[PDB]
Amino acid sequence: RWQEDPEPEDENLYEKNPDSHGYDKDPAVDIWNMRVVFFFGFSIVLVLGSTFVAYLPDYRMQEWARREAERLVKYREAHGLPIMESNCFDPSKIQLP
Amino acid sequence: NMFSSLSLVTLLLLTMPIMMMSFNTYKPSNYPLYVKTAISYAFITSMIPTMMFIHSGQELIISNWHWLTIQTLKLSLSFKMDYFSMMFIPVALFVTWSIMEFSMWYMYSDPNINKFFKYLLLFLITMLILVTANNLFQLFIGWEGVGIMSFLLIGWWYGRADANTAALQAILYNRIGDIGFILAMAWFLTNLNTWDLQQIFMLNPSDSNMPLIGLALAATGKSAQFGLHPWLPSAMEGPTPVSALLHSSTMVVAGIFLLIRFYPLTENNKYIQSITLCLGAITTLFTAMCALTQNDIKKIIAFSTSSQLGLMMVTIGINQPYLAFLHICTHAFFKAMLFMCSGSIIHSLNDEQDIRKMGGLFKAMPFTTTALIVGSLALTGMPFLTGFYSKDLIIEAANTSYTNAWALLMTLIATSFTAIYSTRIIFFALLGQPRFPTLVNINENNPLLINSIKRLLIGSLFAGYIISNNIPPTTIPQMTMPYYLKTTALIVTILGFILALEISNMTKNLKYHYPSNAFKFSTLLGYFPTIMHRLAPYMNLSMSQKSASSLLDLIWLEAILPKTISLAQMKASTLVTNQKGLIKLYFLSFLITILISMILFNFH
Amino acid sequence: THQQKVLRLYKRALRHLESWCIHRDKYRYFACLLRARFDEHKNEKDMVKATQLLREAEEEFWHGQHPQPYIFPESPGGTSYERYECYKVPEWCLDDWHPSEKAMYPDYFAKREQWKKLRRESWEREVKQLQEETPVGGPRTEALPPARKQGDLPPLWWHIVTRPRE
Amino acid sequence: SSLPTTLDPAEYDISSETRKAQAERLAIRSRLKREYQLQYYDPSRRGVIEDPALVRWTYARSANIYPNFRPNTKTSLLGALFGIGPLVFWYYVFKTDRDRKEKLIQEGKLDRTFNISY
Amino acid sequence: KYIIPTIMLMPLTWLSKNNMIWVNSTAHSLLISFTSLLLMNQFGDNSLNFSLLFFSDSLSTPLLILTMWLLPLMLMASQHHLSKENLTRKKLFITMLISLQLFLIMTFTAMELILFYILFEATLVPTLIIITRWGNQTERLNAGLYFLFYTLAGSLPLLVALIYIQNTVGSLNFLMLQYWVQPVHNSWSNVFMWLACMMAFMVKMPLYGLHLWLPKAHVEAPIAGSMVLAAVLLKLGGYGMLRITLILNPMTDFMAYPFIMLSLWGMIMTSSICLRQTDLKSLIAYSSVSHMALVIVAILIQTPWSYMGATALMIAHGLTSSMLFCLANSNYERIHSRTMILARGLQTLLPLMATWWLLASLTNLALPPTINLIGELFVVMSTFSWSNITIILMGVNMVITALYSLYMLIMTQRGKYTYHINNISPSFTRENALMSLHILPLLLLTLNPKIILGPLY
């Protein structure tokens, strides 16, 4: 026996009383919250937001390097002899010994 | 130019019901009819570019939609429209369309009618991707896609635990076969940068490790072989058009279809050539043995898929990829015919899944019985029932080889074995006295059933006369040994049918036979429900509970720091509870600390 | 329950005989052969020999035990549609129908309100009737039928007297 | 795993003292059933009931870690052999593969010609 | 631009009236999440610098966007819960979630090792209060004590490590400054220098050993299945492993070799236990060990392919596992016990949720390329260049990933639910919103996840 603790609460309405609701307390505020402002963040950030995820932010020279490589392939094949790769960063630098 | 434009239309038409699925337009009861009408016009738009291929034209198209610049790679939606990919599309679309017409009659007046066609189109699309795939990544989308859509089709009904395990083992035994394809991904990148079909045909060294636990092991997961095949008879526990779609045209190809595409890699490697027949000769008999003794209307056809699957594996071993898919293209017309006509009998007499209580006579049913006569004889080596254009060309080519004789002899018994299980559908379930247990049994002719199977009858009789005659061949070996190899293939089916007629009459037409007591039946099941359904999940779950959980993850792997917690709580008492009061005891310890500092921890 | 042991073994023997045989005329022949075996020995009363014959009946039944048994129709467990073609929506879901949608077919809604009122009013009488029939502490294995059934309503019905169908 | 024939009509006492014990099985079964039956057929319930058999079932696996295993016997050391054992097993597998690979790079080249990856 | 709108979210909840609260906290966080996707996605040739080091920049961090995406998503889930409690405590609680997200913005943006660490440990205190209060189950204190016992005993060795490195070589501070990096000569003094830097991120990134930190925090959940998404953020919070291995010690990775092996059995044996367990949340908790073990295998190899797979997996797991906890939340709010055997039956009561169950379970497997396949496949292809035998170990994991998803499905596909009188109402409008707002960003990342798996891609 505790004489104070025994007072259980079990009340899950959902449909009984508000008929159509997302959450309890105030049906007029509930429609404005659960169905309006949640869905504006569902519309703007996901549809108008998708035009920023991959759709035209340029993004770390992915399409830039295509125009850069194509002009360098024709340049070093017609005028030069090695095919765009031979030695990296160091042409006749300071030797180890 | 129009060849590339019209090729994507077939991909677009099938996606149009998916794009217009979520609300879109108000169409109840018309949506299942919308699927039928979409594929019908998709067949016409696939027939035209195939006529362009027989004429002249090859094309490999990319959509210019690559989401990779990652370390010297590009993975666009690449579509190969050449021979193996080209011919399969109108074959697959015609087979599915008749099954959609069959899906009008079966699964009728059900609440989940609209939800049923949702997965069937995706089941077609994933296969159509896998067929047209030109990357190895694009190949994976379909090869996993067919394997993942099967779960929502085999386990369509949410009944007993058996179909749930059947839907589980459809992926469980697939994922063991997946390992090879993930090994195929890993080996290709490290050795040949691109891992696309255009690259891998050039620069091909003799490498055994690539298709050892690779392409051959990918062919054991999808399209079941001797390595993993307990999921073959279990898949029939769902609805009948699902079984009509899987093991006839879709699930039956996906394993071998990879090996046909990787044909120059198999040309040079002799170790792979031998192991394809080594894991192809046992598949022809050992799985086909379970067709006669195990008695179910669906399962006899289902166990015979693997026997024909072995013939698809033999063609890999002979190094003829051109005649490899020609068997599977006709196999789509062979077995999809068998599944729906027998499925028509299943649904007609209330609920029967066994051949024992089935007695639909040749005089009793007019159209379904005739479909079985044409169908079962087409599977056997008959001179002009399209089986000659598919099956008989495999046997004649296999005789002239440098390969194993025991592997050849094992397949030769299986070619004669075709006649016995076919008669187990005729003599047992159709022919003789009716055994249907009902006070009133009715089997009515439906307008949807007649128009579906009759159009398939043109496809089953006129397949080898059109497809194999128009397709360009490469080196025909039909010249040597007429009495020893050429005539022996058709004679084996005749001797098999004579043996089947004698064996069935000895068991049925005996009056008082009296069956024996002692039997050795590995022919009945293969004992896979005792080692793979019983022991294989037991060992994985005993190691999970007896060890790992009740030893490691809770007790031992924790223990290390609960040891330091228990030590800190034990050493707490040696300072708190120690010296209970008394200024004497506290000051006596101070004399010692001075004596330690003077002598022990010496600082002058 | 020795009489039940003979009946259960005989019921299993008949339904296992159809898997071995092919035709219906052969099934009748072997059944009469089985009738020649069991009827001859059941006529005389045996105390030790009857249990000896029943343990011997395990043999022959185990020699021919697994040819995949013919459980053809909708049978409990086994094979071929055990618990299938079942949507099976319970009465618990039949109470939570949404407004402006539950108005469709009003005859089903008006009747269900009368069924719920009949259950709520008779539950106090069912608790007294069910609670009255007690041997001492706990029940001795079995259900509780109505003894003093004047008006109506057995003690314990809703799932039993409200199956979905099939 | 079962060793002989499938146990269903085999090995049983012929209506001896076991009949009194078999009648006791239905007495406890119905005792737990009747309290289940009373807390089921009322329309004013609404909610999933406890059932103490399944609550103690979850407690047997999730808890009982340190109240149990207080006599750390030789069987626990045998379980530890399956614990640390496999972790030390791969140490003589991966290193032997690496020393095979690394020696092939330096002396007698085994590197791929078209290896742009990694 | 990300300093003082989250700090301006703090007085919003206190000032707003008792009728509102939840309407303001969600709407004034969704527009803040829009601005993160608007500005942070831009990159030059290498790493930029937004401002002077209070909050720095992004190098390979689209993981910041995920936290901003979960900034309103936690408030969505805790709606049925905390509906019967005090209004002053509602204002107290939302600020504690905001404070977690405040330090989480800081940790991903700040390109330091010193400022990062003290705000990495500043996420520990709010989670402690969130776990030890509003816990529905008993012995939640063990979930609180071991949360700071396992983490702090491993992370306080960073103070003796990080300060030691900057005393010897320049300063760690700016990171892009730290290219004065000398190769580690593999000495016995350098053994514990490597170990102390790793052991701090061996706890939050769960191995096979020291992994009990995770399931206890999930079984004794902070709030039902709502604040578990913050613990998913703590799993991906061990992203410092990407920076320490790359910058501080590139030469000496001989000591990484046993740690890959320890996490290799943290793939199979962690998936084996996740097959029989009764708790539905624990069946997500032990599966989350294996998917995050993939990163620990990847990073220590240090190959360019592994970084592509890892950064994808950090975002992949952050939206898939968290979605699975939302499904566990929807089942717990009706039955009030997370027993898998008891809660059995979909479609009979929950028809629409069953399709969302599929789009969340099958994502644990490698579906048509979402981000999980793209995450996993690059790691498996990276392990082959490390050693050929790995796929034999990795292939077993591919089988049990199907034993994750389908076993969660089958135990809910079995149509019965005889004892259940509750779960009468199908789903609320916000309930199905959680299922959409988690899965639709994964569905949008199927098309082009170029701005997801990006460490120089």
Added chain:
Amino acid sequence: XXXXXXXXXXXXXXXXXXXXXXXXXXXXXXXXXXXXXXXXXXXXXXXXXXXXXXXXXXXXXXXXXXXXXXXXCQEKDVLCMFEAEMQWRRDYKVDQEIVNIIQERLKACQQREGESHRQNCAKELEQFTQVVKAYQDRYXXXXXXXXXXXXXXXXXXXXXXXXXXXXXX
């Protein structure tokens, strides 16, 4: 154009010698579908081109050249190394896509020949072996994650091994 290799000339001409039947059904459909929706889409593309009129110039790719290499800048300094690290990274991003072009050249080699494939070409397979081998030995491919300081050490490691081999032989 220019950068792409392409085929020399496309052949094929209509013969129609054997039989009449109904001529060529594919060619009859080729004339039919040319005016059905191929002409309509060409008219719609021309209407969209005419509606464009005024268009933005867009100055394409930016130059930015040299700015001194990392090998030239001796001793560690944050002000000097930063621009050198950017120069190496820009070259590494280009060198990644150089391989991709030659990769697509080999893709064109497979299709435009078809039947021969391995026996013919001879130039595209040789060009692939000239670039990839240079990419493997110089531009990382063994030096883990990208770093400018590590590349100079990798170049020195290859140079010291070559000098030791040349002096001995």
Added chain:
Amino acid sequence: RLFIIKPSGFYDKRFLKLLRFYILLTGIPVAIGITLINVFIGEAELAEIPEGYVPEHWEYFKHPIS
């Protein structure tokens, strides 16, 4: 004909009706997004001419939205 035992349905269909409304509500700039390529011209492949460096746009090719 008998009365069919079905789930609630109304709550489930309401969410799909609300979802497809708000996607369509921001589905208008998708239609405007086509005209931004169709009516408004993108960018030509023009070589670098000496005039300046970057006035509001440096290398925003293909589409003017960038």
